[PDB]
Amino acid sequence: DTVKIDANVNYQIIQGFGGMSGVGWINDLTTEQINTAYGSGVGQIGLSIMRVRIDPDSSKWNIQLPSARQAVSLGAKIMATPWSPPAYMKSNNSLINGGRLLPANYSAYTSHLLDFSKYMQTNGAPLYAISIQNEPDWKPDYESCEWSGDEFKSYLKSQGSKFGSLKVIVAESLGFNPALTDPVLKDSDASKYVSIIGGHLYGTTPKPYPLAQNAGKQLWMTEHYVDSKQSANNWTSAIEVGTELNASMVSNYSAYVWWYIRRSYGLLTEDGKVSKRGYVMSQYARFVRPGALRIQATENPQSNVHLTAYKNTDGKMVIVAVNTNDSDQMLSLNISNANVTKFEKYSTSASLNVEYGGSSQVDSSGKATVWLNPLSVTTFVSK
Numbered sequence: 001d002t003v004k005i006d007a008n009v010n011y012q013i014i015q016g017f018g019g020m021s022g023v024g025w026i027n028d029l030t031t032e033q034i035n036t037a038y039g040s041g042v043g044q045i046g047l048s049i050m051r052v053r054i055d056p057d058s059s060k061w062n063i064q065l066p067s068a069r070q071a072v073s074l075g076a077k078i079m080a081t082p083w084s085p086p087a088y089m090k091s092n093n094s095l096i097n098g099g100r101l102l103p104a105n106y107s108a109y110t111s112h113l114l115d116f117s118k119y120m121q122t123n124g125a126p127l128y129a130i131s132i133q134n135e136p137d138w139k140p141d142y143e144s145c146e147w148s149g150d151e152f153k154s155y156l157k158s159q160g161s162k163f164g165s166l167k168v169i170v171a172e173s174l175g176f177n178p179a180l181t182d183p184v185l186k187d188s189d190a191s192k193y194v195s196i197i198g199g200h201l202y203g204t205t206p207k208p209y210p211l212a213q214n215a216g217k218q219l220w221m222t223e224h225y226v227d228s229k230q231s232a233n234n235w236t237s238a239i240e241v242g243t244e245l246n247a248s249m250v251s252n253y254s255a256y257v258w259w260y261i262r263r264s265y266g267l268l269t270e271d272g273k274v275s276k277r278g279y280v281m282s283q284y285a286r287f288v289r290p291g292a293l294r295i296q297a298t299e300n301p302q303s304n305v306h307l308t309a310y311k312n313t314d315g316k317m318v319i320v321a322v323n324t325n326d327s328d329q330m331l332s333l334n335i336s337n338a339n340v341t342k343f344e345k346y347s348t349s350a351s352l353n354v355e356y357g358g359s360s361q362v363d364s365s366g367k368a369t370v371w372l373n374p375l376s377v378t379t380f381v382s383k
């Protein structure tokens with residue numbers, strides 16, 4: 001069916017696509033694995049964001065450096081997340097089972113975070129962004145710390161000026177609950193220090209967040225994975241990564257960051273090879289490069305077809321489509337306010353890994369016909 005695209009109607013900036021560097025909790029990534037994940041060529045994922053954890057014990061920060069430094073050299077932006085303050089700062093004097101940061105210690109906590117950022121910078125892995133807390137709404141039996149929306153507002157008002165050019169992220173709610181960040185967004189003296197409203201997708205689905213969007217904050221989805229008991233090469237499961245990416249982009253998210261990059265259910269399997277989940281990610285990340293603008297495009301042109309479109313700073317128009325029908329699906333493209341002459345097709349499916357599948361001419365009226373393979377994530381790139 002018909003897909004209308006208008007290159008002159010723009011939505012969010014895309015910062016990029018990322019994953020978690022897990023060293024300290026799991027084995028570090030290798031040099032080759034970082035090249036596979038952070039290159040953007042054939043067979044590479046195209047990640048441009050790396051997340052790292054801030055250990056409450058500063059004697060363990062060194063272990064983060066080899067992977068973060070290599071990612072920065074490959075053009076990636078590093079964001080850092082703390083799971084807990086040092087225990088002594090907290091109401092429970094424990095790293096685990098939640099506990100609150102004592103207000104008496106807000107200045108000491110800011111010094112902890114900034115010490116981490118200084119260590120990273122001095123050692124050749126400067127941070128792009130830093131978060132104040134992982135999942136303030138979750139109190140599990142591992143590193144954690146409970147915060148309310150009103151605590152984030154107080155903290156940012158008294159501490160936010162110390163962060164400088166670091167892009168500050170709040171609140172990394174487990175389910176992207178606006179209650180955690182609305183008090184900050186409604187006060188200009190807290191909100192001015194914030195660059196990114198970050199959130200996770202556990203137990204939920206992507207949704208727009210207008211107050212954040214209208215305040216000029218980028219929305220970042222800073223952590224998720226799907227069914228961790230599946231192999232990352234199971235296609236029935238991997239295609240739903242595609243569904244979640246499309247929904248994230250439709251929800252105006254500027255970034256999407258997976259959990260552990262290498263894992264049985266990750267973007268690279270333990271053999272270092274790109275997984276079906278990784279290839280799906282790459283249908284977006286190899287082609288929709290940092291600084292791209294999402295544009296207007298018929299999102300659901302026919303049952304079980306979902307799509308988004310973009311323009312990259314170099315002019316490549318890109319369309320990314322998820323086909324959850326078990327049949328070939330035709331699209332009739334009608335593009336306005338562009339100068340596209342042809343699209344190249346690349347698909348991932350049960351049998352294909354970002355494989356080139358043909359070219360379609362785009363006529364002077366902006367019309368083309370393209371086809372989507374059964375059960376596929378397909379990218380069309382203007383060239």
Ligand SMILES: CO[C@H]1[C@H](O)[C@@H](O)[C@@H](O[C@H]2[C@H](O[C@@H]3CO[C@@H](O)[C@H](O)[C@H]3O)OC[C@@H](O[C@@H]3OC[C@@H](O)[C@H](O)[C@H]3O)[C@@H]2O)O[C@@H]1C(=O)O
Pocket residue numbers: 024025026134135142143174202223228260263
């Ligand atoms: C297959 O096991 C998976 C689990 O299914 C995952 O949930 C994940 O577990 C790890 C957990 O990850 C949290 C996932 O939910 C988010 O809300 C949260 O932000 C994530 O942090 O993190 C803690 C980790 O346990 C630590 O492991 C290292 C050990 O030294 C520490 O003492 C533990 O606290 C937990 O494994 O990932 C699992 C996996 O093995 O991949």
